[PDB]
Structures are given as structure tokens and as C-alpha cells.
A and B are shown apart, each in its own frame.
Chain A
Amino acid sequence: EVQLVQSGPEVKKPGASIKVSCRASGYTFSNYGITWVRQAPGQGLEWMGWISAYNGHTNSAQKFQGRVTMTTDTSTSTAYMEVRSLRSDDTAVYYCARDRRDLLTGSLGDYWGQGTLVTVSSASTKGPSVFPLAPGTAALGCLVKDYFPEPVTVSWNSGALTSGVHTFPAVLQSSGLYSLSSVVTVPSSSLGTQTYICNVNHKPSNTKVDKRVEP
């Protein structure tokens, strides 16, 4: 099977430059090209540009022609996109997709990478504060507040509690820090008899916090 594997997440101050990679397997890399597409939070897909791994030709959308440089390395079957002078609205998931070798065909886009999250912000990496949302059916939860960048993962009772769990999409606060809640609905009769612990993992800061949630 064809597979495109992209580099890991990036967290950058505005103005920085980055180089993202996309390694191809399962086909002759140099018989094709690579397209790059991004998706900003809450928005649709935006085409960025294209490079041929056969003849090295490139084209880009006008808004990127000055800041983006695409290259390939046929010896490693890898495509690279350099993005200079990052702005906060470059925050997005960046995708590579297998595309046409030259202009004799139109676009392919038939296999996509898993995406690379790139966050651009003046904020500094910071793990969350975790606060209890204290409770026939009751609700309880954890407020996972003031962290940066995305993402956090939340489990309940180390994964034993999944029924009824809702972990909300993060919101960006005016502080430039993210916040979300994770909630679960449970029987009122379980509150004085059972334990509820939220497990909050924030890989970008390598922090983990467990929080007991009491009535």
C-alpha cells in the first residue's frame, strides 16, 4: 500500500522558520509529485503548492510564493516544505498528498499523509491547571485550563471509565492559552460510593496530572 509519513508537531514563536517533511513508500517517489495542503482551526482545506519529484518543477499559491520553498530528496524518497517568517495564522495542520508528476495530467491527490500540527504563537509551552467540576443522573468533570500548545488527552480512571465521557474541543483564550473541559454523566448513587479521577496528559510540556473529583 502507498503510505506518506510526515514529521512530528512543531511549536514556534512568530517569525520563526520551519522545515516539515513527508516520506513516501509503496511507490516510485520520483514518478510523481507532492502537493501540500493545510487546514487552520475551524476552517476548510487550503492548497499551498506542488513540487515534481521527477523534474523538480514547483508552483505555489500566490500568498505563499515568497515564504515557502519546496524541495525533494530522491535518495530518501522524502519531500520537504520550508516555511519562513511564520505568522500566528499559519497555525494549522499541514498535509502532503501524492500528486501529478508533470502537467500532462490534472491533480491526483490520491494518498495523504497523517498531517503535521504546526502551532505559531507568542505563548510559551505550559502544562495545564486541572480543576474539578464537582457534582438520578449527575454530571462531573475536570476543567483543563491555561495550557499551550494543543493537544491534551483526558482519560477517566485510567481508561476504565469511557461510557458517557465527553471531552470538548479546546478554545483559545484571549491570553493565548487553551482551555477545555472533560465531563462524564454518572448515577447520583455512585457519587458517595466510587472514585472519579481524571487523567490529563499534555505531551508538548511532558506533564501529566491526575485529579480526584469529589462531591
Chain B
Amino acid sequence: DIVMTQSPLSLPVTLGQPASISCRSSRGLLYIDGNTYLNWFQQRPGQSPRRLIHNVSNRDSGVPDRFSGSGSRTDFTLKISRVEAEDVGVYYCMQGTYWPFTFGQGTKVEIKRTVAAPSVFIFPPSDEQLKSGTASVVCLLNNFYPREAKVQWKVDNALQSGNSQESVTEQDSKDSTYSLSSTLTLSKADYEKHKVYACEVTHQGLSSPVTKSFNR
């Protein structure tokens, strides 16, 4: 199998500025017809992949002029001359010379904006859910940038581990921010034997961590 490697894997770009994605193949990709089958695919959020570049350098027919490509037989570059918000998504290289065809791991292009700290909210479980024997406590981190954030749950000052799950939205195509939910799941019995529930948030935009809490 051909190993395809991309770099970088995460690529924040200031809106309007150029961006470059690298792909490397473990074998030269010249096929028996004298062409090099290195394709670039763009996968925008929630969409099927679409081919942007084929054979290293050739733009597909419906592709804006800002996309271009070059490369040797083993080292390839996809260039975006000026990144638009509509270019946010995952870009994959694929070698189409030796089946099984193989893809790079993908490079996620996002818009680089100014640092924005999250607004933090905490939600106790509803009375309706408690009746059914489970407690979900939800911590919301809203409209922040960059994507890296840390959420620590504390129950009566005890740090929790293993009983929470996080989810993060796709970058917002208007303000370039992310939002994140952290959900702590306890049995109703465990929830009712504690008092203070708190989520502690650390982020580049905060000088000190912020804690949102409620008392049962």
C-alpha cells in the first residue's frame, strides 16, 4: 500500500490570506500512461467530497481560480491564493495510481480570528429527567476561539474523571467561533447525595479559569 501523509493537519488561515497544504507519497505516483494521479478533494461541513484538482495540477471544471496544485512525483502542494469562509473544511489528497487507492489523513482549514474567550453556562438536570433515574449536568462554552478548551467537572470539590462526554460544533461560518458542550452523567442516586456542581473552564482567552456552579 502507498502511505499518504499530509501536513499540516490543522491549518488556521486569516481570512483573505494564502494557504498551502502538503502531501507526500511513499512511492512515486507516475502511472503507466505517463500521468501522475494525485487528486485533491475538498469536504465542506455536512457535504460529500468534491474533486478540486486532479493529476497534481489540473483544476476541475467548476473550480475557482484560487485553487492550484504542483508537485514532484512524491511531494505535492495544494495552494489557495486567498482563503474564503466557504473554503473551510477538510482537504484530502488521494493517490490514484496503485490500487488500493489511499488517502491522506486530511487537513482541516479554518478561519483564524482574534482570540475570543467562551461564555460559560451550566444547566442542572431537569426534574423530568430525575424522575426517570438519571441526571445529566450540562456545561456550555459558547462562541470561543481557538478551538482548544479544557473543562473540568467538580462535584463537592471532587474532580471527576471518566463520567463526561464533550462535543464541539463546526466553526461558525460568520463569526469564526466554536461552541462546546460537556455533559456529566450520574445516576439519580449519586446526583442526590452531593450539593455543589461546577464546571471549570480554561481557555487562551481567559486570564484565569472560570467556574460556573449551582447548589442543589
Residues of A within 8 A of B (CB): 35, 37, 44-47, 50, 59-62, 95, 97, 103-115, 129, 131-134, 137, 139, 141, 143, 145, 166-171, 173, 179-181, 183, 185
Contacts and interface: CB of A to CB of B under 8 A. Distances in A.
Contact of A109 (B33, B39, B129, B165): B39
A-side interface mostly:
strand
12 contacts: A35-B101, A103-B32, A109-B39, A129-B132, A131-B136, A134-B123, A134-B124, A139-B140, A139-B142, A170-B167, A183-B142, A185-B143
Most buried by A among B105, B140, B169: B140
A61 B165 contact: no
A180 B179 CA distance: 13
B100 A106 contact: no
Given A44-B105, A109-B96, A143 B33 contact: no
With a 10 A CB-CB cut-off, give which of A62, A106, A113, A183 has the most chain B CB atoms.
A106
Interface of B: 31-33, 35, 37, 39, 41, 43, 48-51, 54-55, 60, 90, 92, 94, 96-97, 99-106, 119, 121, 123-126, 128-129, 132, 136, 138, 140, 142-143, 165-169, 179, 181, 183, 185
Given A113-B48, A131-B126, A45 B136 contact: no
B39 A107 contact: yes
Given A45-B49, A106-B96, A131-B125, A143 B138 contact: yes
Nearest to A182: B181
Contacts of B105: 44
A107 B37 contact: yes
B140 A45 contact: no
B169 A45 contact: no
B126 A50 contact: no
A109 B95 CA distance: 11
A178 B208 CA distance: 34
A134 B138 contact: no
B128 A131 contact: yes
Contacts of A167: 169
